[PDB]
Amino acid sequence: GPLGSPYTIELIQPEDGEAVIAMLKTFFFKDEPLNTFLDLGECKELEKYSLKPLPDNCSYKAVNKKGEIIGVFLNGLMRRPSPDADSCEHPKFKKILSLMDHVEEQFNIFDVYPDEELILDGKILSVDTNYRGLGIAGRLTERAYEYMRENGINVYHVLCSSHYSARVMEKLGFHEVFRMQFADYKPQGEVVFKPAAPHVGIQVMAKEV
Ligand SMILES: CC(C)(COP(=O)(O)OP(=O)(O)OC[C@H]1O[C@@H](n2cnc3c(N)ncnc32)[C@H](O)[C@@H]1OP(=O)(O)O)[C@@H](O)C(=O)NCCC(=O)NCCS
């Protein structure tokens, strides 16, 4: 069973795109809480969204003895915003993107870390259901620390839409620096998202490595 089983942690390469997408379609596309709530289904926009940060060379896969991807954490570099969703044609993903834009409008991680210019952003985290509860997500997260140290990056920022991913980060010493309860997210005056308990809100997590 999964409990005894070895896996490696490896850098995700460009040619890994299709394998990453196939895994995410089985898992993340269906079981990330906002995706679950909306019943996302087929979503090319999220596929492209997931592939986008790969060239930053700081995304990692967990791979079992059969050579199958059993977990991923896709990360990209994020830069201090300057003062200076709309083109998304997938109606369900558009709502998710709008929420993400809203969080950014309400909270700027660079205000918490005024001396930082570049921060690591943990964008997509997914572990095969069969292998959950083994700390794989934590292993994937810790792998990025090596990248951060090599590159003089001090802060790892992870926006969580799951209470379970928030727990992964909490175990690693990330702190929740901003919360937006789904019940309070009322653009145009009405609740857009009501995901299943215990997923009560967006939990923005930050680690100073
Ligand atoms: C979030 C996720 C990546 C965690 O991966 P993981 O490798 O299982 O992480 P952990 O082993 O540290 O488990 C974290 C918590 O998940 C919870 N959990 C949820 N389902 C579980 C299950 N099937 N098995 C065991 N734990 C589970 C546990 O509360 C656990 O906390 P604990 O260590 O205090 O018991 C995984 O649950 C997942 O893929 N969820 C669906 C996609 C998603 O929501 N991604 C994050 C969006 S921000």
Residue numbers in the entry: 16 to 99, 106 to 230
Task: Provide excerpts from the study.
To distinguish the roles of the acetyl group and the CoA moiety in the regulation of conformational changes, the crystal structure of the Dat/CoA complex was solved at a resolution of 1.45 Å as a control to compare with the Dat/Ac-CoA complex.
Acetyl coenzyme A (Ac-CoA)-dependent N-acetylation is performed by arylalkylamine N-acetyltransferase (AANAT) and is important in many biofunctions. Dopamine N-acetyltransferase (Dat) is the first identified insect AANAT from Drosophila melanogaster. Dat exhibits an ordered sequential mechanism in which the cofactor (Ac-CoA) binds first, followed by the binding and acetyl transfer of the substrate. Overall structures revealed that Dat was a globular protein containing a tunnel-like cavity, a substrate located in the middle of the protein, a CoA group located at the bottom, and an acetyl group between the substrate and CoA.
